[PDB]
Amino acid sequence: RVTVQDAVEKIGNRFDLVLVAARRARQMQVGGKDPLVPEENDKTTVIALREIEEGLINNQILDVRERQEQQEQEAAELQAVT
Template identity: 85%
Template sequence: MARVTVQDAVEKIGNRFDLILTAARRARQLQLHQRDPLVPEDNDKPTVIALREIEKD
């Protein structure tokens, strides 16, 4: 089970509402295989991967 804290991601995006929209768009891209993940998948769901990618940047 992945544990993702969104505090770092919120600081990078600006506010939690924009974070949710950004993560949802990215998760949709990953789910539809439109783009490759930028971080290791580790059996995580697309939403978790999207949040980890945002934290990483």
């Protein structure tokens, strides 16, 4: 990793890049989620920006996945209750 130019080419604000990559790295580090790109024993920050460069992560997809994996948890709870 040297430059983050295409990670700004795909998220034009350059400040939303930091929020999306921080949210992604916090999901990968403590929450225990797998990276969507195969790593090379990089740290979670570079894996976050490496997922940004592929395009498969931004704030839209992160909100989609948090709503679907919150509805999945509450659906599992409701089907366990009733």
